[PDB]
Amino acid sequence: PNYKLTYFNMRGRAEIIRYIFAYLDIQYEDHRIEQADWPEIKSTLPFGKIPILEVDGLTLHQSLAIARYLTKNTDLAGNTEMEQCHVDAIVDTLDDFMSCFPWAEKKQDVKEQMFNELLTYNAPHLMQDLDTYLGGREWLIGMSVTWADFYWEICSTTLLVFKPDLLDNHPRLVTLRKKVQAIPAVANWIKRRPQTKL
Amino acid sequence: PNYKLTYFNMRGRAEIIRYIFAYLDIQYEDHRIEQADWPEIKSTLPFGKIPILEVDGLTLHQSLAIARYLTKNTDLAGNTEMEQCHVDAIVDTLDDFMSCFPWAEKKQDVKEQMFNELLTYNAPHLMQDLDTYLGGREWLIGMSVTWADFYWEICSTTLLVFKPDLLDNHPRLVTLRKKVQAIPAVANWIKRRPQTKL
Numbered sequence: 001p002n003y004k005l006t007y008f009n010m011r012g013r014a015e016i017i018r019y020i021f022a023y024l025d026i027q028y029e030d031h032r033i034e035q036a037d038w039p040e041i042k043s044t045l046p047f048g049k050i051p052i053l054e055v056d057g058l059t060l061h062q063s064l065a066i067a068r069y070l071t072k073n074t075d076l077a078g079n080t081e082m083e084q085c086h087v088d089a090i091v092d093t094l095d096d097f098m099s100c101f102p103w104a105e106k107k108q109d110v111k112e113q114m115f116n117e118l119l120t121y122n123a124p125h126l127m128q129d130l131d132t133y134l135g136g137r138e139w140l141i142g143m144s145v146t147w148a149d150f151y152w153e154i155c156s157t158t159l160l161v162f163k164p165d166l167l168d169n170h171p172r173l174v175t176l177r178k179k180v181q182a183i184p185a186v187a188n189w190i191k192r193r194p195q196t197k198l
Numbered sequence: 199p200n201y202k203l204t205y206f207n208m209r210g211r212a213e214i215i216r217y218i219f220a221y222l223d224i225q226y227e228d229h230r231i232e233q234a235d236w237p238e239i240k241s242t243l244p245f246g247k248i249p250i251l252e253v254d255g256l257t258l259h260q261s262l263a264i265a266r267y268l269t270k271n272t273d274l275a276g277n278t279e280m281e282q283c284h285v286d287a288i289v290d291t292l293d294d295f296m297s298c299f300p301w302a303e304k305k306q307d308v309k310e311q312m313f314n315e316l317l318t319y320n321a322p323h324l325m326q327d328l329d330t331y332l333g334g335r336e337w338l339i340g341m342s343v344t345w346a347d348f349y350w351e352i353c354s355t356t357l358l359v360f361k362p363d364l365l366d367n368h369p370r371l372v373t374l375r376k377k378v379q380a381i382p383a384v385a386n387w388i389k390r391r392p393q394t395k396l
């Protein structure tokens with residue numbers, strides 16, 4: 001397949017896909033559109049949202065659907081049907097919390113206040129559940145790295161921007177992030193990707 | 199296998215799993231909890247949410263991850279990997295929207311503002327996109343029913359509680375709901391299930 005990923009010039013919801021491409025050493029066109037392109041790009045999307053990934057002329061959409069598609073029949077999937085279910089479940093838990101944030105809120109002061117409230121009053125209960133879940137194991141699921149680990153590194157990277165001390169009580173979750181960042185293909189992508197806030 | 203679904207006494211986020219069990223003819227315990235029993239069950243769950251599904255003593259969480267686990271290798275999944283991705287992407291498009299509603303909000307003026315806004319402005323855009331996406335086809339993905347058609351029926355049932363004219367410009371979306379509801383195992387479940395608002 002020829003692959004064309006369309007998104008904004010940010011990590012955002014496309015980053016999980018870009019990591020999977022890096023990890024599997026698969027070539028693709030990382031198409032990054034400008035704001036001013038958006039009305040034309042959007043007219044061609046099935047539900048008005050990006051990322052989309054075109055595969056031999058056919059459009060796929062929804063970031064986590066696409067990530068799941070790309071990892072099928074790979075070592076990133078989950079080694080059993082039960083583990084595959086767990087991979088999905090941790091991914092959706094993270095995704096649910098990410099979607100609590102008002103990313104598109106226009107009023108700066110209110111956006112801020114809600115980010116701070118979410119990060120102070122809500123995030124600590126999820127960090128604790130994730131840490132307890134991981135226990136002393138190496139990876140979130142199974143005995144090998146999966147895309148759920150990628151998603152945790154990706155999500156916590158953005159959260160750390162807004163809450164530097166997020167993981168101060170959670171060394172185990174920091175070690176996991178480090179393990180993902182050290183995978184040679186992933187480290188290489190992290191080093192080379194365009195530097196964006198989000 | 200020995201299956202026990204735990205959720206509130208409502209369709210909500212469990213209903214997709216209930217349709218899949220019905221359609222596959224799989225017996226399970228449909229455990230509906232009462233509000234006063236939740237805090238104590240809540241504290242025993244790795245991530246403090248329902249639904250959960252117990253499978254032979256093992257606990258799964260996250261309603262779409264579990265729905266996916268249950269339909270793997272059935273005819274409710276798509277017929278190729280690319281179609282499975284389309285099924286996933288429709289399900290998440292639907293979920294993204296349902297999850298926009300402030301189901302939990304306590305401030306009644308703020309909840310009622312947001313509902314009316316979503317239903318008046320956003321929802322018609324979604325209907326239009328979904329109707330274009332379905333075109334003249336029988337089912338949303340491929341040439342046979344998948345759990346994405348089930349999710350459309352479940353989601354639209356709740357939306358229609360709040361906006362009965364939602365589908366007045368989209369006969370084909372109504373017909374797609376009827377197709378789902380006419381499948382004998384689904385029809386029998388709908389007829390027999392507990393009558394809740396949601």
Ligand SMILES: Nc1c(S(=O)(=O)O)cc(Nc2ccc(Nc3nc(Cl)nc(Nc4ccccc4S(=O)(=O)O)n3)c(S(=O)(=O)O)c2)c2c1C(=O)c1ccccc1C2=O
Pocket residue numbers: 008011012013095098099101103104105106154155158197198
């Ligand atoms: N769901 C989102 C969304 S959402 O809009 O779909 O709710 C948004 C979102 N990020 C995300 C962050 C910013 C913007 N866009 C956006 N919007 C405004 Cl009102 N201002 C700016 N300004 C802006 C522009 C460029 C750079 C930085 C900034 S700034 O936010 O720091 O001020 N950008 C947008 S946009 O696509 O809706 O336009 C998505 C994320 C996610 C994620 O789920 C997510 C998951 C894991 C890691 C990261 C993310 C994530 O970043």
Ligand SMILES: N[C@@H](CCC(=O)N[C@@H](CS)C(=O)NCC(=O)O)C(=O)O
Pocket residue numbers: 012013048049050051061062063064290294
């Ligand atoms: N759950 C979806 C979220 C899709 C989404 O809301 N994408 C944003 C970019 S992060 C978008 O296309 N926003 C532009 C808009 O809604 O107009 C996914 O993972 O792809």
Ligand SMILES: N[C@@H](CCC(=O)N[C@@H](CS)C(=O)NCC(=O)O)C(=O)O
Pocket residue numbers: 092096210211240246247248249259260261262
């Ligand atoms: N995306 C999740 C959402 C899980 C969720 O937030 N469930 C709610 C009820 S719909 C819940 O457990 N709320 C009670 C609580 O969290 O205290 C899923 O599909 O399972």
Ligand SMILES: [Ca+2]
Pocket residue numbers: 092095096290293294
């Ligand atoms: Ca979701």
